[PDB]
UniProtKB/Swiss-Prot annotation:
One of its GO terms (biological process) is amyloid-beta metabolic process. Keywords: Acetylation, Aspartyl protease, Cell membrane, Cell projection, Cytoplasmic vesicle, Disulfide bond, Endoplasmic reticulum, Endosome, Glycoprotein, Golgi apparatus, Hydrolase, Isopeptide bond, Lipoprotein, Lysosome, Membrane, Palmitate, Phosphoprotein, Protease, Signal, Transmembrane, Transmembrane helix, Ubl conjugation, Zymogen. The gene is BACE1. Disulfide bonds join C157-C346, C204-C363, C256-C306. The modification N6-acetyllysine is found at K67, K201, K205, K211, K225, K226, K233. It comes from Homo sapiens (Human). The chain holds residues 60 to 453 of 501 of the full protein. Residues 16-342 form the Peptidase A1 domain. GO terms for molecular function: amyloid-beta binding; aspartic-type endopeptidase activity; beta-aspartyl-peptidase activity; endopeptidase activity; enzyme binding; peptidase activity; protein serine/threonine kinase binding. Inhibited by RTN3 and RTN4. DXXLL motif is required for a proper endocytosis and retrograde transport to the trans-Golgi network, as well as for regulation of lysosomal degradation. The transmembrane domain is necessary for its activity. It determines its late Golgi localization and access to its substrate, APP. This is Beta-secretase 1. Its main location: membrane. Expressed at high levels in the brain and pancreas. In the brain, expression is highest in the substantia nigra, locus coruleus and medulla oblongata.
């Protein structure tokens, strides 16, 4: 993984992309890494915000699956035609595979203004792939076609998606693993939450309601409604020397200080304790104010340092987004159904354990089984 270090570009606001070479003759495109989804989908027509798109008509190796796919999000959507093509990864391992690829032909609110990426690489499992779980995800094709070890890691600074390996130059200190609770999203278990060493003291199921996932495709740390409210009440108590407007706590508004006077100082650390591999252990990742107060420097208040609060409310569980992954080298150890975290080599954000609980309760939440998911065979 000499040749693989530093193969990523981007930032939390706009995302992290990897280079991918699709078809013969080759088209090299910038692809958003997304651990919250399972489709390889590329922009495939002109669009105001796209610098490059996939031109199926220049690819001699493209095969139409003669099926469309419709992907709605709360916020927008994308759709296109399913196909397959040859894929290799310029920085990645020296292999070529034939993968599913959705040619995005229409979308709404998916591509963002000068993102520098043209496509999405869904790295979660086939259980959440569209249109259904028989469309094999990219990484599943990679591993089955090539003997690449079944693991990848993300160092989110530039940055590095390391394929099939762990690289020790990328982190310092302990690598701590938390078990994958279920292979669909990269679902994990949060056993405890502290804000400035103070335990939030909720039933630990409330932290994983209805799931907790590790998602490179979302910007914020997202927290279930009740957890969000309790954290904001607490973070608020800790910085009560500054009274912000509501819109700031809603993520709707910047607050500012005279350039270089920010009182980081009054903002607390957030520790999430992740379930350990050993069954009464846990470990914690500690989030700095700098990870959750994101700088945005707009225009006419050029002289101030200004920030967005990057913790937001959720009704679909906890999402450990990019602002959280950034401080860490994260190892998606698929082969062993675990996720590893260590301090990135790119206060300090900390990975710390072990913490032992004598009576450790089950913190996972079982989602009500709909007749729909019960019907389908697997
Ligand atoms: C760390 C990368 C975060 C990114 S990259 C592009 C966007 C985006 C926002 N609106 N449209 C795209 C975002 C923000 C992100 N939203 C989204 N992330 C991806 C691109 C993975 C899927 C998606 C589809 C749609 Cl249709 C709208 C937003 C998003 C979020 O909700 O936090
Ligand atoms: Zn490159
Ligand atoms: Zn059957
Ligand atoms: Zn299935």
């Amino acid at each position: 993984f000499v040749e693989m270090v530093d193969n990523l570009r981007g930032k939390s606001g706009q995302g992290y992309y990897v280079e991918m070479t699709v078809g013969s003759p080759p088209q090299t495109l910038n692809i958003l890494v997304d651990t919250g989804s399972s489709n390889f989908a590329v922009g495939a027509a002109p669009h105001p915000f796209l610098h490059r798109y996939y031109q199926r008509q220049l690819s001699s190796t493209y095969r139409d699956l003669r099926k469309g796919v419709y992907v709605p999000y709360t916020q927008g959507k994308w759709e296109g035609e399913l196909g397959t093509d040859l894929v290799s990864i310029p920085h990645g391992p020296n292999v070529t595979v034939r993968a599913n690829i959705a040619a995005i032909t229409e979308s709404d609110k998916f591509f963002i203004n000068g993102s520098n990426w043209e496509g999405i690489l869904g790295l979660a499992y086939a259980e959440i792939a569209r249109p259904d779980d028989s469309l094999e995800p990219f990484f599943d094709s990679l591993v089955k076609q090539t003997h690449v070890p079944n693991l990848f890691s993300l160092q989110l600074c530039g940055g590095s998606m390391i394929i099939g390996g762990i690289d020790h130059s990328l982190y310092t200190g302990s690598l701590w693993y938390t078990p994958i609770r279920r292979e669909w999203y990269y679902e994990v278990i949060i056993v405890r939450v502290e804000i400035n060493g103070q335990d939030l003291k909720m039933d630990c199921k409330e932290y994983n309601y209805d799931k907790s996932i590790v998602d490179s495709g979302t910007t914020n740390l997202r927290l279930p409604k009740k957890v969000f409210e309790a954290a904001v009440k607490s973070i608020k108590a800790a910085s009560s020397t500054e009274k912000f407007p509501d819109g700031f706590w809603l993520g709707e508004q910047l607050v500012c200080w005279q350039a270089g006077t920010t009182p980081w100082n009054i903002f607390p650390v957030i520790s999430l304790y992740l379930m350990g591999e050993v069954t009464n252990q846990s470990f914690r990742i500690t989030i700095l104010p700098q990870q959750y107060l994101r700088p945005v420097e707009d225009v006419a208040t050029s002289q101030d340092d200004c920030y967005k609060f990057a913790i937001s409310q959720s009704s679909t569980g906890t999402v450990m987004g990019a602002v959280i992954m950034e401080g860490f080298y994260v190892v998606f150890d698929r082969a062993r159904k675990r996720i590893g975290f260590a301090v990135s080599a790119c206060r300090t954000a900390a990975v710390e354990g072990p913490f032992v609980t004598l009576d450790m309760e089950d913190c996972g939440y079982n989602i009500p089984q709909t007749d729909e998911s019960r019907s389908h065979h697997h």
